[PDB]
């Protein structure tokens with residue numbers, strides 16, 4: 001119902017993702033940790049990298065255990081794997097034994113000037129490194145505690161909330177609308193229709209999910225596939241008459257597969273969401289598929305209902321809106337052949 005302790009527990013810089021305070025080891029070592037639904041490793045700085053405010057000092061932790069194994073993660077960082085006791089101060093009052101990759105070497109990972117020292121992957125074991133046998137933090141948390149298999153994110157344009165183990169109904173207006181998680185690797189969803197200011201792109205819905213479509217807190221932009229990206233910008237440029245290519249400095253609706261056969265709902269983002277104050281055009285091309293980043297997520301309260309293999313969307317109580325236009329989650333809509341849109 002209400003999780004006052006966990007409200008406003010996220011911070012960050014625009015374009016750099018959101019981080020939460022966590023503790024590792026015994027006695028607890030406090031670190032700021034990126035919240036990433038697009039990856040599945042819990043990894044922290046473990047050596048005195050010049051950019052870092054602080055780092056995990058294994059020698060100070062009585063509860064640390066070595067797994068005597070190494071991990072190389074390119075996007076790069078490299079680490080030594082182990083386990084230790086982990087807590088989230090402004091989260092549930094629990095302590096779990098989780099896997100931690102102690103980052104010993106990295107290139108273009110840590111950001112000069114940033115206030116975070118690690119990454120928390122909230123996605124599933126499938127995309128975990130080195131392989132799926134390394135249990136992600138959230139999978140460990142659910143198994144070792146009575147914390148429900150669910151988390152939600154209210155990312156605001158920089159602070160936000162990560163509600164672990166439930167939903168805070170103060171953080172959204174209207175109703176929650178759910179889309180199925182297609183496969184438990186990334187938080188994979190299916191987009192069935194795309195409108196630019198009320199007009200359908202008339203594109204094959206297979207193109208909207210070319211390779212995959214994901215909800216990703218680790219990505220800043222709405223990243224559309226090349227073919228969709230091209231057609232989207234074409235309608236975006238026509239609606240308002242280098243920059244469009246992300247080389248320099250009208251609402252958008254995505255229809256998502258519903259819970260029921262032939263039933264969909266739409267989520268609608270304003271310019272106030274895809275114009276990121278630096279302004280920059282926060283919609284870019286991709287070759288890995290559709291990535292619903294902070295652009296999408298900042299308009300909505302997002303429920304990662306892992307228990308029921310679904311993701312909830314509702315209008316965020318903190319989203320930037322004026323007296324003219326407001327962000328929206330609306331349904332139900334009738335959409336046939338939705339299963340076809342999934343790439344195989």
Ligand SMILES: COc1cc(Br)cc(CN2CCC(NC(=O)CCCS)CC2)c1OC
Pocket residue numbers: 015016017018034035036038039075109111119216217218219223286288289290291
């Ligand atoms: C500031 O730097 C980061 C902040 C945060 Br929060 C997370 C990361 C790492 N994260 C790794 C997974 C990526 N997503 C995918 O591979 C799916 C394709 C999406 S189009 C997104 C970036 C970051 O990079 C190091």
